[PDB]
Write a protein that binds this DNA or RNA. Structure first.
Lengths: 322, 322, 322, 322
DNA sequence: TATAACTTCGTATAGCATATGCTATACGAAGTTAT
DNA sequence: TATAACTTCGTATAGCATATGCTATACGAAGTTAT
DNA sequence: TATAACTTCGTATAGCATATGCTATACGAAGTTAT
DNA sequence: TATAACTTCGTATAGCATATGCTATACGAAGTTAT
């Protein structure tokens, strides 16, 4: 009783031990759960196994994805475990209902998605077009897409790059030091090398932006309607802005998005990562080098990116034809 | 006791958490476990570790495989876990016998088996014997073998195919939209494409069967003693019937089975998957290309299917033959 | 008290859960320990931390290797843990003394050894010589050394091979199915392929021995002074005999062993394994293929086999010379 | 309390279980931990988790690296474990702050450093400036840099070399028998070979120093202000002096240090190991051949040393430059 | 002034790393239904 | 006391999966600020 | 008959797979000893 | 209250290791059995 209050207070005290995104989702699920409780006059904490089961079933009925329902159950599980109480998943009622919800939906044909690919051809086409622009905005967006495709870095890591994090090989190629990504330990970090062509795109961006006037400035910053860039060492270009670049670029070439409300109708933050992976896959690059390139320590996500590649349509056929 | 009553109720309520195949195996083990308990005067529920141990050794003496003995222990473990009772595997005595049983059987030379390969040489020899037959069942069976060997799909998957899953793509070859995954993080479906010679075979069956009349009709259907097919959209061919096509085709060429009681003396549901990988490998297709063929994410099984091929003899044989 | 008696009785009951070699060493250490106790009128079980420390220190003084002292402490640890009592290593006195004993000895220059290499050149030289012999004994020994070098299998696995475990690729190469080695799980097992030349050596051995007259016969058997081989399906050629073949062969070419009492003065059961590894290492075979060949899932033992190879003496030197 | 008294006695008795360097760091952390406790009025022993947490945050605010903060926690953990008390790391509060401290510092861009490379271009430039000097200390320092760069040995290892460790092997180049391992399962020693131009350098130092008179004399020795060397077999040159040769040689070419207080502004003990790997890699030597060079079993560190080389830019840079 | 180009924000869902049994084919044989 | 051609069963054994804990992206929408 | 060619056996030590912090270099600065 | 050239210290931070649990080989020596 007074012990649960402590563990909770201790978790909040050292919040920063967790990603801000984890806390955001924690509070978001809690809102959903509490709201569902208030409406069935149930106690939201500690949660009762039979109530959690009903809630999960309620989520499934709302039509949410299996992965989304796993998130809600998961946040609940952490709140309880980290407080010293047994997890809702510790009961057969909740554990069996999750299995059932996943089996049913998957049986109904539910399948997780992934970003629309941004490959070499796309990058070449975009470059052939924006190359001739003098606008600070265009020069920045081309440099960004360039680094994204070349390095496979996620939008959060690219937004974190500081001017001082850039070096150069003796061949003239730029180097980008990366320290906190989405996984890894000592603090030695890694260096991402840019091709001769892509370093040129970035160089032009540095020149027209003036972000180099201060090393602790972030590489990318905003550019206002009048074309003046606003370097900053305390503010990064929001990852939301970085997704807008991918989307605006897709609109530029293919026009306005559909009206189906669907996800992945245009390029997004992850497009260059999946497109590059599948360009290498097709190039014959080795599994280890690919994993090296994208920073993977496994091979699953990789395998998934080739799945559906047109270049993997099939062998058995010409195998029968002679 | 009130506790286990609640748990059993939990299990019945969310019984969809497990597939029916799992339930049959569960009931199957419980029946054998209980019969043994009656005959040997022991309580079957809850199961005591010293009793489970005497039974596991009883199975070993019955000459069952290690895989089979692990199934009985596994189901017994499930029954107890989903009942709120401790699992038999968590006791010292049971943990020791399983370890000792596994050690002894492997040391006595016990080995897992796998389907008798059905390769091209076989498909051709079959096609050259059936090809011209005008019998409905002959025209159907050839179309099945072709798809099985072409697509590498399992029998349950071939049973589900509806007429409305076959479209036209590239050269007017047939295309089959399927689903070969059952996990959240996986590909919802997939498109198996057929060669030309195989697409024809399917064309002739569809035209003599009549399953085309209704798009929701299953591609493969029953064909009675009069040589008449019976299209349906409510019932598909049993996987047992599909396995029967494989054995009947073997009889056709080699006659009555070897009677030794052994397994895989003729072709079975997986015969074509074993053969397709060996033929594919013999041509030297990309490892991943062979994996996309059968839907593998790893090579543990495919490696098993091609083990005895000369292409897989290794570096030492390579160094020795200078 | 009565509980410790049970766990022990349970361990002995299911002895077979452990390798016979483990039990042998268990009983051997127990003899050493009990003997040391009887001599200092100490109680051998349960063992007292301060007594175990004194015993370990006593072992070090006797001049035994660090690895040998780790074995004694280890058997003691298992006896106690498996009985339900805390392990002698659970105390700082014992845990600190082991660290110290290892540090001191290693500081004094103690270093673990490894078998004298039996490589390709050696195999060619031996073959060039024994090839022309008509003796059943010579024909058997050449076939054995051949399979050893070609497959890298340990002496225990080679001794276990049954006539029925041999198949052939369509290229004419022999195949040897291996099921229990020194690690691995399902019961599918593995197949070791022999080069065309080595299969010929084995074929000749089968022909002159007649071990094929029964499939459940072990491939290798003894050969008496009059040259008559004695096939058997219940007895294998002792691994001790297999080490004698390596040693006799070394004597045949280099003469009688030294008189230093040292280990690894002649070829032993592991020589072909370390020699083959280092022939591949030198051949440029890939780390994964090598590990594949020797059955390794890591890379440490491998790295150790090249260490000291003459072919790895060094780069920095010619790096400075121009 | 009687219990911890016994444990501390255990630790003192078998103090050889840890190296003196470990003990110094232990005493160093205990001193700082206690001083802080006095100033902040908390008991230093046993250490309470809420107190340890306030101290860990105190270190972070002192601006210490994550590695340093882990050392203080580590030693505190050792002190308690070897005392029979619970370890600070095993408490929720401490586990949370360490996680949060590590997250924050990495996110603020904290990075591990490594020695300023000392490459061939440097060795040549140094040799071309010293080569002809007739000063004892000059003739010694050149011999040290040469061996350091040639052998890739660490400073403690170069300090241990005795005259009786250098023999003649192949072309009359010098050979150095060393020991660079400190684990049971490892190579007891090793033979570092020197180029011709480097073997000469060592020859001249030995002839002007006189360490040869006694084989048990350390290769490298003191050289006073009069330019006279002082061979000894009881005392070796401090590793601090060896580090001093590296900095003095840097001063020689580039002058006074940068004063910013930063680390690795000039060469240090590991400068030659970083440079040797980069030069070696630049020539394209076998990865394993580079590993045997510096005595590595993996590539985690070597990969760090060569990160910014053009040869290590990756597959994407490769695909992009068509 | 309006407005580009963002930033912040909340709900929905993918990425990724580590630990752990459920689900499908095999096949003899009994049961079923239309020739 | 038909039988071809199935389908349904029960039990043995082969073929790959799924649950965990967090951290990060997806995208519409409301708020912000230098032009 | 003797004896090759083993087999069994007990003590010593390597092989191998999985989980977990100790040990060495960095460097300013204080202490030391022979020019 | 010299100073070059060290060595000894204390504290910060980089470089890889070691303890576990079993299972398998190394080799001299005593016992075995068909010649």
């Amino acid at each position: 009783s007074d012990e649960v209050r402590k563990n909770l207070m201790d978790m909040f005290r050292d919040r920063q031990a967790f990603s801000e995104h984890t806390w955001k989702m924690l509070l978001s699920v809690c809102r959903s759960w509490a709201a569902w409780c208030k409406l069935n006059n149930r106690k939201w904490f500690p949660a009762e196994p039979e109530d959690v089961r009903d809630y999960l079933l309620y989520l499934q009925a709302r039509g949410l994805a299996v992965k989304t329902i796993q998130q809600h159950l998961g946040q609940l599980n952490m709140l309880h475990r980290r407080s010293g109480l047994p997890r809702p998943s510790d009961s057969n009622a909740v554990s069996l209902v999750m299995r059932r919800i996943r089996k049913e939906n998957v049986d109904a044909g539910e399948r997780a998605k992934q970003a629309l690919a941004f490959e070499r051809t796309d990058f070449d086409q975009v470059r052939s077009l924006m190359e001739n622009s003098d606008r600070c905005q265009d020069i920045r967006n081309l440099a960004f897409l360039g680094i994204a495709y070349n390095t496979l870095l996620k939008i959060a890591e690219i937004a974190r790059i500081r001017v001082k994090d850039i070096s150069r090989t003796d061949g003239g190629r730029m180097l980008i030091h990366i320290g906190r990504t989405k996984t890894l330990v000592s603090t030695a970090g890694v260096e991402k090398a840019l091709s001769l062509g892509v370093t040129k795109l970035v160089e032009r961006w540095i020149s027209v932006s003036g972000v180099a006037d201060d090393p602790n400035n972030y590489l990318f910053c905003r550019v206002r309607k009048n074309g003046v860039a606003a370097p900053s060492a305390t503010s990064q270009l929001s990852t939301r802005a970085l997704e807008g670049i991918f989307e605006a670029t897709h609109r530029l070439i293919y026009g306005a998005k559909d009206d189906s409300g669907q996800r992945y109708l245009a390029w997004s933050g992850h497009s260059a990562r999946v497109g590059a992976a599948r360009d290498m896959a097709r190039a014959g690059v080795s599994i280890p080098e690919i994993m090296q390139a994208g920073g993977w320590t496994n091979v699953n996500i990789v395998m998934n990116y080739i799945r559906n590649l047109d270049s993997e349509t099939g062998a058995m056929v010409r195998l029968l034809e002679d």
